[PDB]
Nucleic acid binder design. Structure first.
Lengths: 121, 202, 32, 127, 29, 72, 144, 189, 125
RNA sequence: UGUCCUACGCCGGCAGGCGCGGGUAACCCGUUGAACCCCAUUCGUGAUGGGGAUCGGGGAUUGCAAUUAUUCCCC
């Protein structure tokens, strides 16, 4: 797998400052505006779940309300239980969602699911 | 504003207005769905088409809907221009030309059904001094009651513009011996509101 | 005519009068 | 003017019929992947008088136009003028026209369906 | 005259589920 | 119904416009395109070519309408 | 006794000035000639390939009629009717950089420089240039 | 002398209809260079009888939505139409225009009456001012819905309609509608 | 010495200077025949061809405009020219010439002396 | 109507940035240079160079946050 002509192995090594060109406009502006601390604490919890799990199966699920967080290229190997309004939808982080958010995997509304008179006299 | 204010039906629905009439997909849609509602309205037996007097068919779009399901019909019309337009549409049913108010010229106990498509709201007014509207409506209703099979069903689609016209048509129908009533499609609506005279013999 | 229209008319007439009456360095030195 | 003896009514471009009964700025617009503005900038780059019809176009003109079509980047075009310039899989500067565009949209929809994001799953539910 | 099918909160013709599509039937004399 | 106006002047229609545009008594792109079954752009281009030849006189110039008359 | 731009019609004067600038050959020309639209409300490329010369003649006309106006006023002059889809149409301004490059080209033709009280003002030899080109326009038009 | 559009003369214009001297207002005193006058000709009763027929014709194509306001294109269209008529009939287009006005006037039509449901038509007469008004409107409808979907220009369509109405041929929509009006008047005496 | 007059319209206001000269007609620093809407050019030729171009060869007129649209400005220009000539031939020339000019110019059109008193009515709640 | 209105210079075709001024206001934006209309070219009766919906991608702007396309430009 490659993303914008860049493989995952060098994507992990490629750093925070030059993330700008490999992204789209919106998350580039979001990273330029200054990233906050709550999603840093979420990253810390995700990685703390990632350390002590044994490395021959998928680690423990990390759950949150954060629907609007930018997926880093180093997210590959996490399990995110994202809120939707009632429950936690827990989803596998494949390498293919680097440019996406967490809101489009947690849908807040259900799909919608929606005889003639005959005279006798 | 309305086609009834333009003049007589023999001369208003001429070559060019019928030519612009057939090229109107909105007219196609409304005519097919009103023809479907009219065919669903009468309680004809299933798997057995009936002998229907199609009055006011004109271009025969309702007649085309009848012929699409395997039914058969004969058409009575008053304008030759849109009659020729219907002929040019490779239509299957037969067509007759004449004034329906002078009397239906067929034998009694013949027609198992009657389909009127926008032809009863036409005749309420008079465009000639020799034509009496009450006499014309009474003669048309009496001839229609004569030619119908006893127990057949007659549906008449209309859009009256006031309650007095409906009063005259209903009193002519109830003085002609027809038994039935009035069915309105969405009475509290404006775009979807249609009027349907339903009649039978006995 | 009206207030605004007459004001515009008199302003344009004064402008035309000044333009038709029309057809250096500031003297910083007090004494020559 | 008088018809040429080599006048064609229908050309075969990108395995597609192209009507010569149209302007050169709009006959090429018939095939997908190119509209009016891209046709204008190409024919202005191709140094072609725009008043000509499409039926008297010589051969050498149509292969030079098609070699503009495959690799216009070397012919001094702005690079934000393109459709697929930063692809998610392999970021490379490109312009798909007739069958490449269908493959691009198909792989976009199947990528969205595979990752079960909201956009592609709503597209799947919409049809 | 279709009083059961007239919406109380709106002008129009509201559907009912137990009964078929909205209409109004009146007899002749 | 569906019109089939030609996109370029064939030899035959070029011959009739050579021997017939001096005598119609009225010249405009509309009736030329109507009766010759030709593209209106070709009709207007043909009349600019013919006034370059100078055998039909101008009456007035406008972006939407051009009107012409006989020499005699 | 000498004629004026105000004493001649506008369009043939503008195209004559554009022709004189074309056979002058000393204008600087951008590399983005045939890939540019001069406004955001434009839909197509201009059909005139040599539209920079007409643009230069037009901006020389508008600077001669009123000087001291820069790029922003020039974009205000050539704003048009933006048909933004099914939204109601509105008014849009012209492109700043195209008019900027054309006016810098006229600055390079020693026809215009800056002004201390505002935008750009034109050279007096620009007034002689427009004077004798208006003379030749009046000779070719009013004497014919 | 005052000539319309620089080349049309109002001196040779003669009104053949005896009833319409004072309603077709085109003579030496009504002679104007241009139909654009912007005079308050509708704020008083029977004032538009003094309006020039060319000005009423330019007010007539000022119709049908998008064309409202834009009368400079209208006077351009009628100038081209006057040129086309003068090139076709070989004489003054004003005579063709007034002949078309005279020949396309509905002289008798039907009014609608009725007390309760029964509506009949009574044969009534049309005033000469309304005759001119209905003739102008009928030529307007003929010019507008004549072609409406092809290369046929509005100016030459208006010229053809005016020429065929002046000649009295059956090709004119105005002539056919007028003849239908007197025939249905005769049908409803 | 000279005479200054004004011409009015809905929102188009014009000033006009008439003086001695060889018959020069100028509007906004331009001659009268190249105002941008060419179609109403005969309107700009309505006053002078009403009187005769040989008579205007002693008067030079210059008109400046501000406000209004195109045709409103044209009407203001022609009304201002007409009132400039009648004022010039009233104050400086004998009364008979002014009287005959006024008579012919009032039997031709009404608006050429006093403009049409029409304006947009304001909207109130 | 304004400390958000912006004059002007530089960069990028445009979306927009950078720099320096004017303005708490008939002073600066702003002789408030707008659209329709006017002149010339191309188009030409064709679901067509009309109409633009619904889509894909990129870029930029606004903000704690834009995914359920905030918004704009282009294809």
């Amino acid at each position: 797998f490659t993303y914008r002509g860049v493989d995952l192995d060098q994507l992990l090594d490629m750093s925070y400052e030059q993330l700008m060109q490999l992204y789209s406009a919106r998350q580039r502006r979001r990273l330029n505006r200054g990233l906050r601390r709550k999603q840093h604490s979420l990253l810390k919890r995700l990685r703390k779940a990632k350390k002590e799990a044994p490395p021959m199966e998928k680690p423990e699920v990390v759950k949150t309300h954060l629907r609007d967080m930018i997926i880093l290229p180093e997210m590959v190997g996490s399990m995110v239980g994202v809120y939707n309004g009632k429950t936690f939808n827990q989803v596998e982080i494949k390498p293919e969602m680097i440019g996406h958010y967490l809101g489009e995997f947690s849908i807040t509304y259900k799909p919608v699911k929606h005889s003639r008179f005959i005279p006798l006299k | 504003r309305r086609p009834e204010h333009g003049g007589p039906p023999e001369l208003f629905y001429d070559e060019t207005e019928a030519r612009k009439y057939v090229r109107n997909s909105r007219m196609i849609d409304i005519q097919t769905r009103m023809a479907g509602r009219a065919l669903e309205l009468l309680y004809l037996p299933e798997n057995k088409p009936c002998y229907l007097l199609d009055i006011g068919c004109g271009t025969g779009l309702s007649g085309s809907y009848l012929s699409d399901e395997g039914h058969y019909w004969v058409g009575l019309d008053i304008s030759p221009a849109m009659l020729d337009e219907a002929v040019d549409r490779e239509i299957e049913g037969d067509l007759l030309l004449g004034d329906m108010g002078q009397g239906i010229p067929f034998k009694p106990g013949t027609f198992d059904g009657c389909i009127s498509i926008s032809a009863v709201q036409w005749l309420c007014n008079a465009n000639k001094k020799s034509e009496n509207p009450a006499k014309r409506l009474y003669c048309f209703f009496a001839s229609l009651f004569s030619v119908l099979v006893r127990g057949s069903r007659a549906v008449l689609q209309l859009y009256p513009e006031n309650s007095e016209q409906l009063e005259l048509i209903t009193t002519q129908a109830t003085k002609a011996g027809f038994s039935g009533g009035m069915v309105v499609d969405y009475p509290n609506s404006a775009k979807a509101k249609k009027f349907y005279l339903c009649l039978f013999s006995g | 005519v009206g207030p605004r229209l007459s004001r515009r008319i008199l302003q344009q007439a004064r402008q035309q009068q000044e333009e038709l009456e029309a057809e250096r360095e500031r003297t910083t030195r007090l004494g020559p | 003017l008088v018809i040429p003896e080599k006048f064609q009514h229908i050309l075969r471009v990108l395995n597609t019929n192209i009507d010569g009964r149209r302007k050169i700025a709009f006959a090429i617009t018939a095939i997908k992947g190119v509209g009016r503005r891209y046709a204008h900038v190409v024919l202005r780059k191709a140094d072609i008088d725009l008043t000509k019809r499409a039926g008297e176009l010589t051969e050498d003109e149509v292969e030079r136009v098609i070699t503009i079509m495959q690799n216009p980047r070397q012919y001094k075009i702005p690079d934000w003028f393109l459709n697929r310039q930063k692809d998610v899989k392999d970021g490379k500067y490109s312009q798909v026209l007739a069958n490449g565009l269908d493959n691009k949209l198909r792989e976009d929809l199947e990528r969205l369906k595979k990752i079960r994001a909201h956009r592609g799953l709503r597209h799947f539910w919409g049809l | 005259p279709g009083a059961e099918y007239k919406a109380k909160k709106a002008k129009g013709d509201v559907k009912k589920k137990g009964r078929p599509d909205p209409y109004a039937y009146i007899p002749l004399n | 119904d569906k019109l089939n106006n030609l996109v370029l002047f064939d030899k035959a229609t070029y011959d009739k416009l050579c021997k017939e545009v001096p005598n119609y008594k009225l010249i405009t792109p509309a009736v030329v395109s109507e009766r010759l079954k030709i593209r209106g752009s070709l009709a207007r281009a043909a009349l600019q070519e013919l006034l370059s030849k100078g055998l039909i006189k101008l009456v007035s110039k406008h972006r939407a309408q051009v009107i012409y008359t006989r020499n005699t | 006794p000498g004629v004026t731009v105000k004493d001649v019609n506008q369009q043939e004067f503008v195209r004559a000035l554009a022709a004189f600038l074309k056979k002058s050959g000393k204008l600087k020309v951008p590399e983005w000639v045939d890939t540019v639209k001069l406004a955001k409300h434009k839909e197509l490329a201009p059909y005139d390939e040599n539209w920079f010369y007409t643009r230069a003649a037009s901006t020389a006309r508008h600077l001669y009629l009123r000087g001291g106006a820069g790029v922003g006023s020039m974009t205000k002059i050539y704003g048009g009717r933006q048909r933004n889809g099914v939204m109601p149409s509105h008014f849009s301004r012209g492109s700043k950089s195209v008019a900027r490059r054309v006016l810098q080209a006229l600055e390079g033709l020693k026809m215009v420089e800056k002004d201390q009280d505002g935008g750009r003002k034109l050279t007096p030899q620009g007034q002689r240039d427009l004077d004798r080109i208006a003379g030749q326009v009046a000779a070719a038009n009013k004497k014919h | 002398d005052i000539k319309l559009f620089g080349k049309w003369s109002t001196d040779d214009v003669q009104i053949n209809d005896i009833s319409l001297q004072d309603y077709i207002a085109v003579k030496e005193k009504y002679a104007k260079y241009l139909p654009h006058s912007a005079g308050r000709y509708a704020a008083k009763r029977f004032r538009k009888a003094q309006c020039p027929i060319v000005e009423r014709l330019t007010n007539s194509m000022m119709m049908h939505g998008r064309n409202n306001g834009k009368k400079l294109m209208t006077v351009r269209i009628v100038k081209h139409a006057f040129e086309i008529i003068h090139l076709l009939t070989g004489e003054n287009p004003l005579q063709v225009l007034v002949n078309a006005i005279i020949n396309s006037g509905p002289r008798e039509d039907s009014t609608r009456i009725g007390r309760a449901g029964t509506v009949r038509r009574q044969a009534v007469d049309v005033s000469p001012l309304r005759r001119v008004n209905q003739a102008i409107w009928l030529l307007c409808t003929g010019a507008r819905e004549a072609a409406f979907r092809n290369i046929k220009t509005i100016a030459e369509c208006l010229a053809d309609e005016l020429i065929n109405a002046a000649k009295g041929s059956s090709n004119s929509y105005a002539i056919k509608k007028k003849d239908e009006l007197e025939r249905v008047a005769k049908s409803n005496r | 010495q000279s005479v200054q007059v004004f011409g009015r319209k809905k929102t188009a206001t014009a000033v006009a200077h008439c003086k001695r000269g060889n018959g020069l007609i100028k509007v906004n620093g331009r001659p009268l025949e190249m105002i941008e809407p060419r179609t109403l050019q005969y309107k700009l030729l309505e006053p002078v061809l009403l009187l005769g171009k040989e008579r205007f060869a002693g008067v030079d007129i210059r008109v400046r405009v501000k406000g209004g649209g195109h045709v409103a400005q044209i009407y203001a220009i022609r009304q201002s020219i007409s009132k400039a000539l009648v004022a010039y031939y009233q104050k400086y020339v004998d009364e008979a010439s002014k009287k005959e000019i006024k008579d012919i110019l009032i039997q031709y059109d009404r608006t050429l002396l006093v403009a049409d008193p029409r304006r947009c009515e304001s909207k109130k709640f």
